[PDB]
């Protein structure tokens, strides 16, 4: 469980907004804004 | 006495496995008394069977009979006091007063106490048979909130609470508001006579559990009314009975029972203190068939959408990514599937969700802005009328243009309470005040 | 319409 | 023979005097044997005669007591034998309270020794509540309430009492989470500075600290603390880094603390590698992470949404699922926002956003909610987000920080600053809340 046992350099994404990393759902969502322009 | 059953010992186990290869031999020990911290006394969870002495019920007989006769209230006062004096005694005697107690008041209200408020003139014109009356009528009497260790004749049986409770709900739901200070003592009164049994049993459930869906309704006929009460006093009697009633439903899943309307009752206790983390840890500890009952559910949901990270309070901390979602909350509260009760305690907040509401939108609103039309204001944060919006706009010292806009730029305070200025007057939605008029107090309460 | 911090 | 281990105990040497039979049994039958036929006046004069006793009265009943122990122990039975044990405890710690008392520099390790068994032994006893016909958590709550007795009695002038005061802490709060009652860990906390006599927190020993800002951390994030949980969790990690790995339980604790940690700096706006963490966490545990960080990266609220559905019973044990669903939400909107943000203002140079836009961009990143026929009842996951609320989800972004812009509710449209950099529209997450919500620093003293 969560209680500790007994005893006898960065780790995190620094630039991770920055970076673009292509997935499923950022191409959905820009097909969508394509599309509300277009209807615009 | 330490407990010393063959089946417990053999349950619990040894400290080691082999004792004989220590050099250990089998002894007999003498039955060593409990340690002090071990001793608890246990509230009882299950029915009880009410059993008198047949003296005692005697007595009272010779109560009501010398009560009939005497017309005099001084003479019958008295007479009373001394049987009284009598009665202690013989019960120190009997050893059934100060140990396990059972009241033996069958009657709502007790008869010595029926005449003691006569002859003091504190019998209101409800408990009373006609109003022209002058003594207090046995049938229609309910005890006062007491404030000597009170004998069994003055404390009523489990049984009869229910039945007394019951009477409240049918006969005295309709005189509100006029007799919220006589409900509210006199229900008070009712949970009093259980801790004096030490009784938590299902009648101590049943009765705890309407008395709090009564002070929720009483809370929003109040502010229907516009009838000045006490507020504080309300919601500190409420939060009193949740914390209460949510300790008798731990007890009772510690004894592997169960509670029909447990699931309800903890939505409540999360309503009680909105901006307290302290109860979102003690719902996630509570089984899953709990935590995931639509009443709880809906219950949290609203404490994510008042919470707000701007929200200032004296000896408030803000935290981190508050949703402030006061127009999720106000579409919420005209949802058909929000139970009644909840709306009544959530309106309580109305007044400090609307002030955050206009505070974060007049950060977002540039220096050369139009005034924000009052209609924009009504649907948004749901008004009851433009008379209500104008007035909480003067509350807060909101510039008002033409009678019909509000310059949100001029808003200054960041905090919806007013070190000077009394609280605004408590409101209520009008959706809510709707489905209330559809349905009887008597049928609500029930469930 | 032009944006203004605040 | 009773004698001679009352010259022991008088002299100071405890080397027999423990609760721990397995260590201790040959030497306690025998005694029980020979002291089997006498009466507790007799063992209390027994004490008080013997030469060279201390003429302290604390130091009289306990060795008193631990005769009595002795005496009366039942080893087939340990509910019969509970009492004499925390009885003997308690006066143990008792001694324990004066800071002259006498053998009290060796008196330390026994109290810690007898402090691991002991709790061991409550554990086990309060599992059976119920057939015992005593409160949950009592054993326990006792206990407690000896050890705090004994950590307010510790102030500043190396004492051995001071040396294990931050053992006593870690040891009073792991019992109040276990007890369930973690709210009573503030007072050992507001107090615990002012009793330590050590000149800086970091003079501890290392294995101390990791477990006292394990708890710290894990405090605050039961009042939604988040920030001031992280820098604990975070300098926590930092410091069991160094510590070797080859023992193989640094590690079981090294995933404890992650476990908080890594929601917690996602909150934040913090995303961690998964290479150093490699080690510390199972492959199971990097994928069910990585679900969720690819659900907040790109604004998909039905995916955080669904991620904490799933998740549910672990998350809860925790205490993790209601400030999930608080702050999760609203690092989610700022992603969907600065993903829109990007492809409608720097690339088509457009600075208006309608609500319209928002709107039908919304109900694509949440999806069905409570109003729609598919979720005819309310839950916890479809009951806080509608895309309706599109200047509401606005307003608090721009409130928080997270985003700058100015909203119209008469237009229906928020305009934003024309400028083909990104980062004057939408700040880094961290840097933003990290500034509106200031943490206390991870260095205590």
Known sequence: ?40 | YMINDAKTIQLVGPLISSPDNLGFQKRSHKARELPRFLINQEPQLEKRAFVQDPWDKANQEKMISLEESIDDLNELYETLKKMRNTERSIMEEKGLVDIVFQGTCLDMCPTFERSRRNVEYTVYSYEKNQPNDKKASRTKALKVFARAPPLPSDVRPPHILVKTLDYIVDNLLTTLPESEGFLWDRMRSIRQDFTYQNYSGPEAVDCNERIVRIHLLILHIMVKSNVEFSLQQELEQLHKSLITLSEIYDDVRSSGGTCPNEAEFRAYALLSKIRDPQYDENIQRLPKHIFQDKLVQMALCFRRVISNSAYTERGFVKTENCLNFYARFFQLMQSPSLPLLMGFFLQMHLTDIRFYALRALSHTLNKKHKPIPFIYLENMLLFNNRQEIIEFCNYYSIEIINGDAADLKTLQHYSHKLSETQPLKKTYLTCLERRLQKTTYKGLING | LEYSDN | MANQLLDELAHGNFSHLTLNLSQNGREIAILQKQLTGFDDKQLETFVEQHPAMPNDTRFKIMCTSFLNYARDVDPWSAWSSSDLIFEFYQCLINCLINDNAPHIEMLIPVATRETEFIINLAGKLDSFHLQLHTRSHQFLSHISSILSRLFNSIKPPIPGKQRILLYLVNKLNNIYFRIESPQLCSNIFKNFQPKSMLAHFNEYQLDQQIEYRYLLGRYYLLNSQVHNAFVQFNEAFQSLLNLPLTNQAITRNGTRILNYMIPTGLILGKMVKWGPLRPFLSQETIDNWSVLYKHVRYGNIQGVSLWLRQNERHLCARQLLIVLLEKLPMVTYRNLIKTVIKSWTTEWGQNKLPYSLIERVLQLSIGPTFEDPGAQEITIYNGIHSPKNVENVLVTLINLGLLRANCFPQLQLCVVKKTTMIQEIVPPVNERITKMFPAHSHVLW
């Open chain 1, 1 to 40: 469980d969560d209680e500790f046992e007994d005893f006898p350099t960065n780790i995190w994404e620094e630039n991770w907004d920055d970076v673009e990393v292509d997935d499923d759902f950022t191409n959905e969502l820009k097909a969508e804004l394509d599309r509300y322009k277009r209807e615009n």
